[PDB]
Ligand binder design. Structure first.
Ligand code: JH9
Lengths: 157, 104, 85
């Protein structure tokens, strides 16, 4: 099963990032990232039908690209170049990105900050700031409907 | 070349923008249209430095790079009181409550 | 041209009307608005958000980071939700 209900939730989260560039081509991503700081990244659609999404990221040697596959309800990095045995699988593609961003805080994958396609809502910027401080949404002095809002996007990027 | 500002007197904060090339006097004209006091009844400040009407905001040290829309630079404003100017007085914003322990 | 947004502790923020229309809640309201539950350390940041949102929508400029201190983030979230921005 492709688990389309899970896929739709994942693509909704992706729509909330403000750093998903949709049908952007590899050349357009290169031009956007050519002068960005090392680790600057975005996600966009892949030209390749075996892949759902592509990470474009500035390396020291110039922009590079890394595909993401979605199989059996799981996202993971391209298993043709990654050792499929050492590949973590995710229910969420924003979670996938956030995991690798945070692991970098601790060709190699090095991700720092996203290139935004548009300025997010102030509510979302607050959500990001809160998520960078804690994951314990359940105990924050917020009304329930704002806790539900935070729960819809738990990520730090 | 845009500079983004907070013009502050007492408990009043004007959010506005201008160019590095515009003058202190032209800022006072913006203030005049909002607060209805003429330029010669205004003094403008960067920190404790009184600003000369004839100088550009860039000449006073307000730069695009450091007066951004998400972090505007503050210009202090004092008005005429009787035969003199009031002392510059900008009243602070309220202070945030203590952070919940889990986000410290 | 300008509107006046007043915090709970009595600070007056005079902002471009077009920028304040960033908030659906202010926009539905509309020249003076009193926010009985938003204190000035929150509302000042809201106003900076308006300037930032207008400047960086439909622009060709790289979008910079919007700084939010952790100590205001919970109140700022509540205000932004109330303001629909
Ligand atoms: C754990 C993982 C390790 C990892 C491995 C890699 C390997 N990466 C590639 O060998 C990709 C292959 C690709 C190319 C295009 C593409 O875009 P699309 O999906 O749209 O076809 C998707 C993938 N080579 C390029 O990027 C070269 C390039 C650059 C700029 C440009 F203008 C055109 C091409 C990258 C980072 C890593 F951390």
């Amino acid at each position: 099963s492709m688990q389309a209900a899970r896929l739709a939730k994942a693509l909704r989260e992706l729509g909330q990032t403000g750093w998903y560039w949709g049908s952007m081509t590899v050349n357009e991503a290169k031009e956007k990232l050519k002068e960005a700081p090392e680790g600057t990244f975005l996600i966009r659609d892949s030209s390749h039908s075996d892949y759902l999404l592509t990470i474009s990221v500035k390396t020291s040697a110039g922009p590079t690209n890394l595909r993401i596959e979605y199989q059996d309800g799981k996202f993971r990095l391209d298993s043709i170049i990654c050792v499929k045995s050492k590949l973590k699988q995710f229910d969420s593609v924003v979670h996938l990105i956030d995991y690798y961003v945070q692991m970098c805080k601790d060709v190699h994958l090095y991700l720092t900050k996203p290139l935004y396609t548009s300025a997010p809502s102030l509510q979302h910027l607050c959500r990001l700031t809160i998520n960078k401080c804690t994951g314990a949404i359940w105990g924050l002095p917020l009304p329930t409907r704002l806790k539900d809002y935070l729960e819809e996007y738990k990520f730090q990027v | 070349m845009d500079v983004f500002l907070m013009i502050r007197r007492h408990k009043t904060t004007i959010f506005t923008d201008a160019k590095e090339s515009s003058t202190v006097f032209e800022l006072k004209r913006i203030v005049e249209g909002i607060l209805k006091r003429p330029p010669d009844e205004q003094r403008l400040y960067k920190d404790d430095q009184l600003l000369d009407d004839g100088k550009t905001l860039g000449e006073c040290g307000f730069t695009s790079q450091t007066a951004r829309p998400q972090a505007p630079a503050t210009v202090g404003l004092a008005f005429r009181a009787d035969d003199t100017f009031e002392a510059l007085c900008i009243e602070p914003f309220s202070s945030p409550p203590e952070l919940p322990d889990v986000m410290k | 041209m300008y509107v006046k947004l007043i915090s709970s502790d009595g600070h007056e923020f005079i902002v471009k009307r077009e920028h304040a229309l960033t908030s659906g809640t202010i926009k539905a309201m509309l020249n003076e608005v009193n926010f009985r539950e938003i204190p000035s350390h929150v509302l000042s940041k809201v106003c900076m958000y308006f300037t930032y949102k207008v400047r960086y929508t439909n622009s060709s400029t790289e979008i910079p980071e919007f700084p939010i201190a952790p100590e205001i983030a919970l109140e700022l979230l509540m205000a932004a939700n109330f303001l629909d921005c």
